[PDB]
Design a protein around this ligand. Structure first.
Ligand SMILES: *[C@@H]1O[C@H](CO[C@H]2O[C@@H](C)[C@@H](O)[C@@H](O)[C@@H]2O)[C@@H](O[C@@H]2O[C@H](CO)[C@@H](O[C@@H]3O[C@H](CO[C@H]4O[C@H](CO)[C@@H](O)[C@H](O)[C@@H]4O)[C@@H](O)[C@H](O[C@H]4O[C@H](CO)[C@@H](O)[C@H](O)[C@@H]4O)[C@@H]3O)[C@H](O)[C@H]2NC(C)=O)[C@H](O)[C@H]1NC(C)=O
Ligand SMILES: CC(=O)N[C@@H]1[C@@H](OC2O[C@@H](C)[C@@H](O)[C@@H](O)[C@@H]2O)[C@H](O[C@@H]2O[C@H](CO)[C@H](O)[C@H](O[C@]3(C(=O)O)C[C@H](O)[C@@H](NC(C)=O)[C@H]([C@H](O)[C@H](O)CO)O3)[C@H]2O)[C@@H](COS(=O)(=O)O)O[C@H]1O
Ligand SMILES: CC(=O)N[C@@H]1[C@@H](O[C@@H]2O[C@@H](C)[C@@H](O)[C@@H](O)[C@@H]2O)[C@H](O[C@@H]2O[C@H](CO)[C@H](O)[C@H](O[C@]3(C(=O)O)C[C@H](O)[C@@H](NC(C)=O)[C@H]([C@H](O)[C@H](O)CO)O3)[C@H]2O)[C@@H](COS(=O)(=O)O)O[C@H]1O
Ligand SMILES: CC(=O)N[C@@H]1[C@@H](O[C@H]2O[C@@H](C)[C@@H](O)[C@@H](O)[C@@H]2O)[C@H](O[C@@H]2O[C@H](CO)[C@H](O)[C@H](O[C@]3(C(=O)O)C[C@H](O)[C@@H](NC(C)=O)[C@H]([C@H](O)[C@H](O)CO)O3)[C@H]2O)[C@@H](COS(=O)(=O)O)O[C@H]1O
Ligand SMILES: *[C@@H]1O[C@H](CO)[C@@H](O[C@@H]2O[C@H](CO)[C@@H](O[C@@H]3O[C@H](CO[C@H]4O[C@H](CO)[C@@H](O)[C@H](O)[C@@H]4O)[C@@H](O)[C@H](O)[C@@H]3O)[C@H](O)[C@H]2NC(C)=O)[C@H](O)[C@H]1NC(C)=O
Ligand SMILES: *[C@@H]1O[C@H](CO)[C@@H](O[C@@H]2O[C@H](CO)[C@@H](O[C@@H]3O[C@H](CO)[C@@H](O)[C@H](O)[C@@H]3O)[C@H](O)[C@H]2NC(C)=O)[C@H](O)[C@H]1NC(C)=O
Ligand SMILES: *[C@@H]1O[C@H](CO[C@H]2O[C@@H](C)[C@@H](O)[C@@H](O)[C@@H]2O)[C@@H](O[C@@H]2O[C@H](CO)[C@@H](O)[C@H](O)[C@H]2NC(C)=O)[C@H](O)[C@H]1NC(C)=O
Ligand SMILES: *[C@@H]1O[C@H](CO)[C@@H](O[C@@H]2O[C@H](CO)[C@@H](O)[C@H](O)[C@H]2NC(C)=O)[C@H](O)[C@H]1NC(C)=O
Ligand SMILES: *[C@@H]1O[C@H](CO)[C@@H](O[C@@H]2O[C@H](CO)[C@@H](O)[C@H](O)[C@H]2NC(C)=O)[C@H](O)[C@H]1NC(C)=O
Ligand SMILES: *[C@H]1O[C@H](CO)[C@@H](O[C@@H]2O[C@H](CO)[C@@H](O)[C@H](O)[C@H]2NC(C)=O)[C@H](O)[C@H]1NC(C)=O
Ligand SMILES: *[C@@H]1O[C@H](CO[C@H]2O[C@@H](C)[C@@H](O)[C@@H](O)[C@@H]2O)[C@@H](O)[C@H](O)[C@H]1NC(C)=O
Ligand SMILES: *[C@@H]1O[C@H](CO)[C@@H](O)[C@H](O)[C@H]1NC(C)=O
Ligand SMILES: *[C@@H]1O[C@H](CO)[C@@H](O)[C@H](O)[C@H]1NC(C)=O
Ligand SMILES: *[C@@H]1O[C@H](CO)[C@@H](O)[C@H](O)[C@H]1NC(C)=O
Ligand SMILES: *[C@@H]1O[C@H](CO)[C@@H](O)[C@H](O)[C@H]1NC(C)=O
Ligand SMILES: *[C@@H]1O[C@H](CO)[C@@H](O)[C@H](O)[C@H]1NC(C)=O
Lengths: 172, 330, 318, 172, 317, 173
């Protein structure tokens, strides 16, 4: 991955996160929890669906063409009929091998990129009240119960409320 | 203090992460030949339904007959007389059962007829003065009587004259007429004179634009249903306003009329698959196939709305992120 | 106040334009540029290339020397133009493998012709016909020499012509098929004619084909045009005993960059390096949707009529 | 895009910014103001013009080819003549559809990257004298007049001069 | 009591320029060429079985031109035809010459089996001063030039059934004399004819009396034809004059063999790709040497050079 | 560079680093030093080698085909045989032109990425004990000897050990 988050600074995925592609796990005063993030998940799915719309259920109608198998030998004009079909197939085969390879490199990148977007988004919320521990975890420098964690997940965490307390716990 | 599931009362840990599955699937990329992702979807169609679906395109089973033997009117192909198709299916176990013949440039006629998608025939009352009509053979039995191709008229001498036959037929329809005619090559000079009087035959079908001339070719051939003689089919196309003319002093296998040429999206396919009531907009010699995927490995020969044939039997497009499992050891 | 705020941002426009991407079908961006040429000028531009109007004539009739196609005696072209309203007004004919002869001349790009003193002893030359009226007389295709009997009989001709040059000579000849046997003997004496044109590496025999055809201008008979190519150092030979429509000379074959194109559009003065039947097109874009048939420096034909390449960022107004 | 800045953590574009592609808006002791950044703007334009050079005025010269329209019905070799031309058109049609798709995807990503490059460039200049408010806005914790802003735009801002002041405003 | 840690990347003295989507020229630390544009100079004979036609073309070797007798039961993966090859037997022509050349080239073998065609009432083994084998008049070895025996030439009626598991290739011909004297001298009948037929197909050919230009002292000609015969079918031949008879069949194969025109030298080396210019290596995906090729070959393209970056952007001080 | 590290906020490459693509240069109580980061170097090389193995020798095996040079002029079917080979060659010429152009853009972007990955990795270890000077250099606010620098390079640097000493130096004057 190009951003180095998935299979990077995040050691591994969570197999117990069945209701999302991206999300949080927390440990606070009320216990340890888990929770998916629907926005980021949907961002990744939608792009992936975007690619599927271009490739799936997309075919040309074709009718009469040229013969591609032969009973007798006929030299020149059959050599030509064969070469044409052989040339066409090799060219379409290349196009397919390349389409997939490209899209896949890009799928892995845009997912890795969405994981990084969530981390940056959350970093901005928490502001001076937490620090990057590495591994994808923040250490929040104030008591933050389940409601408080929800406010971060909801996108409604006002950092000014805990700022003074937090600065004190970081430096003293 | 060790199993405490809480944090130390004035801090908390907020970890960000992503999902992962116990059984991922490998894909190809620009930089990796095999790389595990959470999920993928096959882009190459390599399974066939097993049979040809005949509710999408009109599929005509030719059974024991080829498209040409249907057109000419070989007796055992009489069923196909007046019939149209999107795809004509030719079987491997098919055979001919009339007078032995050859069609110089067979393939072209076969294609021309196939694309048109119809054997609709219109008889024209040609005047053939001075000759015996409706020749037949034991090599082409209709019942227990000698007979011939239903769309051809074998002409022989009448009494002591094979006159110079001189007949025209102006295309006044608003479409192109297709004419099938031919010439007889007998197996000896005794026969050439016995049937046509003249020592040396000739056939000349002509338009205002084009012409074709053929001479018979005397000499024995291998037996086919008891007959050393042979026939050769040729074809002519007449356009609206143009006129047909047929000149011959011997060996003519005259036409009984024309076939009506359409500009069509129809075709012909060599296949031994069963035809059946199912749903599919793409047909191949192996059977019909679905067209949800963009590519296919079933057959390069196809008719209809089909995925494009490639050499690869599989190409996986990733529909999920890199898979990075939790448990190194299960 | 002793603090400040410094915001960063990007530009946008009232209404942008929609493009395709790998993940979106449509998505707004600030600007784009069209890569498919959809529309032509209307005329065929006769400036960058030497366009030659056929008007009433085909390339084949021009070569053979149809009385009304005399204009094109020694003319050349990069692109020959054939009108739908053209016709032949000479002796009725056909050509086996017509398209191929037409292709070979168009490619050579020239009707440069050099006559040769063939010796046709024992036969009356320069035969004509009412169907091919030139000016006001029974004439014939200018490049072909119709040979007939000389009173008593028509001898076995046997004529040679060696290629001394170092380029390919193109020869055009044919054979006459009459409408009756009484005619076949009236002009060619013998019961059945024959034409055997051969080189030291090749040969072609055509037998005439007596019998009436449909009525074209008043004539029941026909002429079938054939052709032969003699290489450097090689030698031509023609051996006929009846029905020979002999050649007068040879055409020069140049390996060229020329062609022929069917069209009914106006040829006129303008700038362009690409030519289609619909007219000339500008070749600034990589692709085009006008007409698959083209000549010159041309955008590649595709089936789409529009493709916008994004030349700006994502557009996000306020 | 993939960096999540344009149509991302920056809420929307500025229609008022007509003298550049990326830039700054700022308020201070002297009031509000706007100013474009030429370096970032020009980095993006060069890359887009770079693509135009590969696409625009790149045209193969061709002469006599094969006949593509037919008055008569011929069969075998006409069937081929068409199929050849039909194969060619489809493949170029695909090459064109894909080119545009990839280039556009890429264009969005590079324009988004330049936006982000400028943000990270600014963040580094400020160092400890400012915080990331979000929306791509910085709170500069000291009196920063027009001349001061100019140095941030010019890349000549010396963070040590205001350090003791801003740092004192940030924690107290 | 402080320190400085700097993160960085390498650079080289002399990088190398490459194309990108954005830049026509941009310097990187290294690259690798994807267009193979230089050839070894000569054709390598160790990888594939290369066969030098020398003074013979493929067709002359098949027919059995006396100076081509060395190529009798030969086989090849690739058969090399030299610009200096010449025909030295009776003068001939072959309608659709290219097709027969292709078919034999593909089969990759001149394995000929002779058969006992019974020709009665005719003298066999006609020859010519135009086709000398040693100092004596001779002919194409695989062909049999029949003429009248005694004072007549019958309507020949011969069969030969293909009771084999493969397609049989039959090469036959017709003779065209230079006059009616010569037509009636050799064959009696004033008008010759050759009909070669199967149960499926047939071919009739009329000769054409008339003088052609001298080739090795002869103004006559033969036109060569062929007939392929399938398992279970039966070849019949009927002629009252001018027949240039077959002596047997060539065993056809579906094979991976071919024929190439080249004047390149053929020497001991190794390479899995062959062109008219010489063999080329195949480590690169593309090439610009020649569009004519045989073997495991890079694909031919217009461009003579295409550099793939194998390193990062090169940024020196 | 899509991240703007190589040829961006990092001013230039180091010709003096000859046993690695990425790495460190440092100044501290024991002198100055340089070491290559094996892990990031290998990440790029592995990715670049993947591409090589995709393109490099994946050639088909063709045998007998159609003719492509001619002596005699012929017309229709020779026109076709020429048009087909010409059509084929042009498409493969497009494919190779694009292939190279896409790969190189990607090769540049992915090398640029490994650089920025290494930086961010390092920044996260240092935490509150250093600041970003610009130019890809950190300013570590404690006595960080060659062993300390080594622990940063190993990814075993324990910031709590120096946190007090560091926080103390950053917020002073
Ligand atoms: C990834 O792996 C998942 C995990 O599944 C498995 O668990 C691992 C640890 C191993 O033990 C594996 O052997 C095992 O597969 C996959 O999920 C499973 O997917 C399979 C098919 O791939 C499902 O098979 C179906 O089982 C249905 C009944 O399920 C219950 O009983 C079975 C034992 O019989 C157990 O496996 C389950 O755990 C359940 O307890 C069954 O109803 C289905 O067949 C039906 O249809 C047929 C007609 O053909 C009919 O005759 C029959 O009566 C049935 O009604 C079928 O056999 C499996 O259930 C599912 N299991 C779970 C727990 O999810 C997953 O497929 C895979 N993903 C990918 C992409 O491969
Ligand atoms: C009422 C009637 O039958 N009158 C006789 C004429 O017959 C015919 O009239 C012409 C207009 C034509 O349409 C015929 O189809 C029609 O029957 C006859 O006129 C001629 O008849 C012959 C018969 O084939 C030719 O058609 C002949 O054609 C010419 C020509 O093109 O003008 C004469 C020309 O010199 C000649 N060129 C040669 C020998 O090099 C050609 C050539 O023979 C043919 O093109 C070969 O296919 O034809 C036309 O004149 C007249 C004249 O007869 S005469 O013997 O020529 O004197 O006689 C009426 O009784
Ligand atoms: C000046 C003169 O009249 N001299 C004749 C001489 O005629 C000629 O010389 C030869 C070399 C040739 O170039 C002729 O074009 C030239 O006019 C007679 O020589 C024979 O001529 C005949 C033609 O009538 C043949 O060319 C024949 O050549 C062979 C040959 O070598 O190919 C002899 C073969 O035995 C024969 N093979 C057969 C029948 O199977 C072939 C074959 O007939 C021919 O290729 C078919 O197209 O021809 C020359 O031997 C010379 C002897 O004439 S003879 O008595 O009829 O044999 O008499 C001089 O006075
Ligand atoms: C042992 C013996 O000599 N028996 C002969 C018959 O010889 C043959 O047997 C027949 C069945 C064929 O296999 C022949 O090839 C074989 O020689 C001979 O039978 C007649 O032979 C004729 C050939 O010369 C015909 O084949 C004829 O049958 C037809 C046919 O059914 O196809 C009869 C048709 O009416 C006729 N159609 C026409 C003229 O339009 C055709 C036609 O002639 C040929 O197809 C043209 O190529 O032939 C068959 O009965 C007879 C001779 O009888 S006959 O009076 O000459 O007719 O004599 C036995 O003793
Ligand atoms: C030139 O030669 C030709 C072939 O060498 C001659 O043709 C032959 O003519 C005879 C007599 O007319 C035919 O005899 C007939 O053969 C058929 C074939 O049946 C075969 O298959 C069945 C299978 O059960 C088997 O029972 C038979 O024994 C045969 O093997 C018989 O059905 C008839 O009763 C009859 O006897 C030959 O068939 C035929 N041979 C070939 C190969 O075509 C021809 O007569 C000669 N022509 C001239 C002008 O001289
Ligand atoms: C019809 O005309 C042709 C064309 O002229 C005649 O062919 C020529 O025949 C003569 C001998 O009869 C050849 O002469 C020979 O030339 C060679 C040259 O190397 C020389 O070595 C001999 O001594 C002899 O003089 C001449 O080459 C040949 N024409 C060619 C090759 O172009 C033919 O005789 C005529 N036939 C009839 C039936 O009228
Ligand atoms: C990661 O590095 C630390 C730091 O110490 C050093 O780094 C080495 C790569 C090398 O440059 C060495 O000269 C330098 O001292 C390692 O700690 C050291 O471990 C060794 C045993 O391997 C001990 O002998 C040292 O006392 C110890 N020093 C300190 C200060 O801790 C550490 O082992 C290494 N870890 C890994 C996983 O490689
Ligand atoms: C937006 O794109 C348009 C074209 O889509 C550009 O306008 C063209 O600019 C160049 C000048 O070199 C020329 O091709 C034409 O004169 C212009 N008009 C066209 C092609 O229609 C331009 O780059 C952009 N214009 C904006 C942003 O206002
Ligand atoms: C055979 O018949 C054709 C037509 O069926 C005759 O051609 C016609 O000839 C007359 C003049 O006598 C013309 O007015 C007509 O235009 C011709 N018709 C066509 C269709 O060409 C022809 O004369 C006859 N020929 C023979 C040899 O009998
Ligand atoms: C991912 O792979 C595919 C989609 O990319 C999913 O398979 C399809 O799921 C839906 C059913 O809701 C339908 O489109 C088809 O019935 C499924 N495919 C079949 C039957 O081949 C699949 O569910 C996804 N896998 C995971 C693990 O999420
Ligand atoms: C956001 O959260 C506020 C309180 O915390 C909550 O946690 C959430 C995850 C939710 O499920 C509930 O347990 C609580 O609401 C709440 O006051 C706000 O209303 C929430 N706002 C929005 C827009 O969701
Ligand atoms: C928990 O926090 C309180 C202050 O709220 C403090 O007095 C107490 O010592 C803390 N204990 C631990 C172990 O953090
Ligand atoms: C182009 O053709 C037209 C046809 O009328 C003519 O007027 C004009 O002079 C021609 N232009 C050139 C440059 O030959
Ligand atoms: C940038 O602006 C500052 C203050 O406005 C000024 O002192 C300096 O000269 C400028 N630098 C450059 C390089 O333009
Ligand atoms: C760089 O690539 C070239 C050409 O592919 C090769 O010869 C050379 O050894 C390589 N150099 C390095 C340092 O990898
Ligand atoms: C190889 O041979 C061809 C055929 O003549 C020649 O034109 C071409 O330039 C040569 N290619 C080389 C030497 O790479």
């Amino acid at each position: 991955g190009i951003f180095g988050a998935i299979a990077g600074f995040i050691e591994n995925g969570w197999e117990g996160m069945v209701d999302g592609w991206y999300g949080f796990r927390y440990q606070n005063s009320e216990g340890t929890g888990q929770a998916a993030d629907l926005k980021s998940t949907q961002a990744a799915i939608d792009q992936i669906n975007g690619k599927l719309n271009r490739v799936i259920e997309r075919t040309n109608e074709k009718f009469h063409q040229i013969e591609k198998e032969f009973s007798e030998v006929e030299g020149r004009i059959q050599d030509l009929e064969k070469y044409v079909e052989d040339t066409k197939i090799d060219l379409w085969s290349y196009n397919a091998e390349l389409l997939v390879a490209l899209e896949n490199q890009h799928t892995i990148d845009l997912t890795d990129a969405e994981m990084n977007k969530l981390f940056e988004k959350t970093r901005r919320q928490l502001r001076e009240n937490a620090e990057d521990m590495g591994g994808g975890c923040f250490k929040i420098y104030h008591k933050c119960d389940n409601a408080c964690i929800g406010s971060i997940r909801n996108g409604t965490y006002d950092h000014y409320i805990y700022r003074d307390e937090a600065l004190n716990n970081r430096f003293q | 203090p060790d199993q405490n599931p809480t944090s130390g009362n004035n801090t908390a840990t907020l970890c960000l992460g992503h999902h992962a599955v116990a059984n991922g699937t490998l894909v190809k990329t620009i930089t990796d030949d095999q790389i595990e992702v959470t999920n993928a979807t096959e882009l190459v169609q390599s399974i066939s339904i097993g049979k040809i679906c005949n509710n999408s395109y009109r599929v005509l089973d030719g059974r024991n007959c080829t498209l040409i033997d249907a057109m000419l009117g070989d007796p055992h192909c009489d069923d196909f007389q007046y019939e149209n198709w999107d795809l004509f299916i030719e079987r491997s176990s098919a055979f001919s059962n009339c007078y032995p013949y050859d069609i110089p440039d067979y393939a072209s006629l076969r294609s021309i007829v196939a694309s048109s998608g119809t054997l609709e025939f219109t008889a024209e009352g040609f005047t053939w003065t001075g000759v015996t009509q409706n020749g037949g053979s034991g090599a082409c039995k209709r019942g227990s009587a000698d007979s011939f191709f239903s769309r051809l008229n074998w002409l022989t001498k009448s009494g002591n004259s094979y006159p110079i036959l001189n007949v025209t037929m102006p295309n006044n329809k608003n479409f192109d007429k297709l004419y099938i005619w031919g010439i007889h090559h007998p197996s000896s000079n005794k026969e050439q004179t016995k049937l046509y009087i003249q020592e040396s035959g000739r056939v000349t079908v002509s338009t205002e634009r084009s012409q074709q001339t053929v001479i018979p070719n005397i000499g024995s051939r291998p037996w086919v249903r008891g007959q050393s003689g042979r026939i050769s089919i040729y074809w002519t196309i007449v356009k609206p306003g143009d006129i047909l003319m047929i000149n011959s002093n011997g060996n003519l296998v005259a036409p009984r009329g024309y076939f009506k040429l359409r500009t069509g999206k129809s075709s012909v396919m060599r296949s031994d698959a069963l035809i059946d009531t199912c749903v599919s907009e793409c047909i191949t010699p192996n059977g019909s196939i679905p067209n949800d995927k963009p590519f296919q490995n079933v057959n390069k020969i196809t008719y209809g709305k089909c995925p494009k044939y490639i050499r690869q039997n599989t190409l996986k497009l990733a529909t999920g992120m890199r898979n990075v499992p939790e448990k190194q050891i299960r």
